[PDB]
A paper describes a structure:
The SAM complex facilitates outer membrane β-barrel precursor protein folding and insertion into the outer membrane. Sam50 forms a 16-stranded β-barrel which is minimally closed between strands β1 and β16.
In this sample, 3D reconstructions exhibited several conformations, with monomer and multiple dimer conformations present (here, the term monomer refers to the SAM complex, with one copy each of Sam50, Sam35, and Sam37; the dimer refers to two SAM complexes). The monomer conformation, although determined to a resolution of only 3.7 Å, is virtually identical to the monomer determined in lipid nanodiscs and to the monomer derived from dimer 1, described below.
Author numbering:
A (entry chain C): 2 to 75, 105 to 178, 237 to 260, 263 to 336, 339 to 376
B (entry chain A): 24 to 128, 141 to 262, 264 to 285, 301 to 333
C (entry chain B): 156 to 173, 179 to 322, 332 to 406, 414 to 428, 447 to 512
The structure:
Amino acid sequence: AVQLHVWGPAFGLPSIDAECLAAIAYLAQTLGSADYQLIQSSPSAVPTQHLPTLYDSRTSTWIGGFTSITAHLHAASATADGTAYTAFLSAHAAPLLALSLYVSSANYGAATRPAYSAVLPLPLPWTEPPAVRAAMARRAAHLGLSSLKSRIRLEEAAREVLDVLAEVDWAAGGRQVAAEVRCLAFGYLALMLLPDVPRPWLREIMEGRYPALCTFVRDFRARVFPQGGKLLPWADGGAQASASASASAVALRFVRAVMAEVPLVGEWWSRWWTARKKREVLAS
Amino acid sequence: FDYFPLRIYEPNELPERSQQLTSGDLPTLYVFSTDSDARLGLPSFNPGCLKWQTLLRLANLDFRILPSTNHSSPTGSLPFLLPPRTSPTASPAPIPASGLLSFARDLGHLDADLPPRAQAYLALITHSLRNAWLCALYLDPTHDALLRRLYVDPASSSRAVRAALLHQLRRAAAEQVATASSGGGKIVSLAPVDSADGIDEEAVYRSARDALDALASLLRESETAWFGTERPGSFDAALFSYTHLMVEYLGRMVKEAGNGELAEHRERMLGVAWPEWDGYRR
Amino acid sequence: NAVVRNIFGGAETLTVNATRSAYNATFSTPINGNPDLRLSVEALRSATQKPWASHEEHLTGANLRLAWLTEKGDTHALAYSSVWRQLTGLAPTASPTVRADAGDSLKSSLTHTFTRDRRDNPMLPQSGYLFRSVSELAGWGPLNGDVSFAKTEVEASGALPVGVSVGGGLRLGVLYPLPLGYSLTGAAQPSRINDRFQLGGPNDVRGFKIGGLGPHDGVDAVGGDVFAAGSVNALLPSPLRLQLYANAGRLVSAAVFKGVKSAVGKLTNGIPSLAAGVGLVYAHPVARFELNFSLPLVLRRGEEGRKGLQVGVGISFL
């Protein structure tokens, strides 16, 4: 009776972020429709504040992150490569993702902002997508590229990642990896391919140069995510009515975020809040 | 115009503090060392600098080492170099961290395009292992004494300033760890999360134990005592930059990675880099 | 700005938020009724930029000051200060003397400012004469910290009419390192770059750049311990009048002693820099604009002297 908290169904992938989509694929391949619940949520609706979060009903513990979630629910060069790529996708690949859909303004404002505003309550989109863009842009450093013949640098910063991810043999070959790192690749290689954006420079690179990835990302979704991934055991209310357990609470989500923005006492108020919230995790 | 300067005399005899430090005869690498072990040339204690110093000592460059303080630098990062001074009032331009191997010159092995596979492991070193060094040094009260003995005491020596520095360090260390998704991608403000509670000392530490298990597994496949090569390259020096500072100062994990691969490898880099030294192992 | 003209007696607070910044939470008060013994308490924080030695400087300290105005025109001001003095701007091509001094310090010190001013117009000398002393004893004995010196500075101008008003001037200074504890013996740490003197530009010795005329390390102007400067005017003629200046200047425990006796011994070996040039003075009630024209004569190699049109304004010229 595990209980995961994920983002919304926005772009045809039952999630809008790589971590939670990866966790959803893992759970859907491993556990079964009668074990989890997928309570769609928001980062300010959980003690961990790191949204892809398992809540184990048996002992009532919050487990943040995808790696830590995989810590539960479970030659050696195989697992060596598994750890290597699982550490190479959380960085040098999340920034390449965040370069689109989170930094490029011509793309952030036509598909991602409606995505967020269509999965939260009414007053929340006024504050949270700003924080999400801020985080994904801060992680989008260490690349030197910004909101931009100034595109050969872009294609090179994309090859420096897709070339490493290319020789994996994600689906069969080269070097079979694992059942928890594969479901992580499809977590990133989906939001880098599938979205319908108005400023595409990530699709054609992979579709035009890397066929081994195009087939996997298309074959994988054809395996566990048929017809948009609604067959997953969502909450009882439905896709949109999933976030029903939390108008009273939504106000508290609003005041907490906006109060952390006053100039001087804001920072200290935030540090008092997350320090109080975290001590609920260890106690759990 | 005209010839107005009627007498031009000799140069003006630079001050005292700029004759003892910057006299110069050898290229002078500026690292995070201490004055007692900066003359003997012992390794630094800041891994982002021990990496470059190890590369240079592998580059067969004979040079000096002088401590510094992270503000005197062409860029933000410290380990720059300053070529020897040619005339007592004029010096060549510094050399930023990136070009230390461009100035050090068969030195092609230390800077090569790594195979597409080992470029994936370098994430373990620079992102998984680097966070365990930040989380365990700065944001652990056990090492409150150690951090104080290295990064602040030789800075200001005035208890109202050491504390102002110490707080600006941990506010910076807790930031660079709270961003890499090993510890936490917690979303809390349109501001970075710089606090020892925006992360978790469990997730960061558990990945580091998994890192040193993957790295130790790569070395057993090499059968040439180094990571798939013949002589120490840019990948051996990057792991030794962390597998040492965590052993000289997490320590039982290195010596227990696999069967002793990372502990033995470190003791075989201090046979190629520091051949006459003794006194490691804490 | 912001003022408060009373709290209890004749007290006052203040705040100025204006180089790149400053925040002076000044809080003045007279003591024992007498309206002269103006005691102050200031807590400033500023990040000023100094381009002649290419870096910044972040003073982030606080100083306590006690002024006093006797009945003969002179004015004593015994001040205690504690600052931070961080140098964090060595981004451009800076010279390896400043790369050895980025660092950080404290500089607990204690000054004393004594200015007997008998000049008629403080902006345009006609018959008066100014004397001014600034004695400073940084961290030593009770004053802790990590800089330990002893700095003094004397300026004694002149003027004489015969309106024509032949002028004059003089400055001096010595920076003496001292040990760190309750003694006159021991280790005397050499001086850093936030304590050495500067001398040049249109305010001090007309005819050189704002920081030149000193020991140079390439393009940056690191200071010097001991120094001296002169001047001679004419001030020939409404406040708008003309000028003929011919300036000058230099800039350079048994160990620390024979070091100073050697420098000031060198201070009289050879012609000084000794610039020259004419100008037009404008005696505004708050300032003195110059708009001059200079031709430097003698130079110590590498000292960057201007060669004309040196417009500059201030209060304390030479």
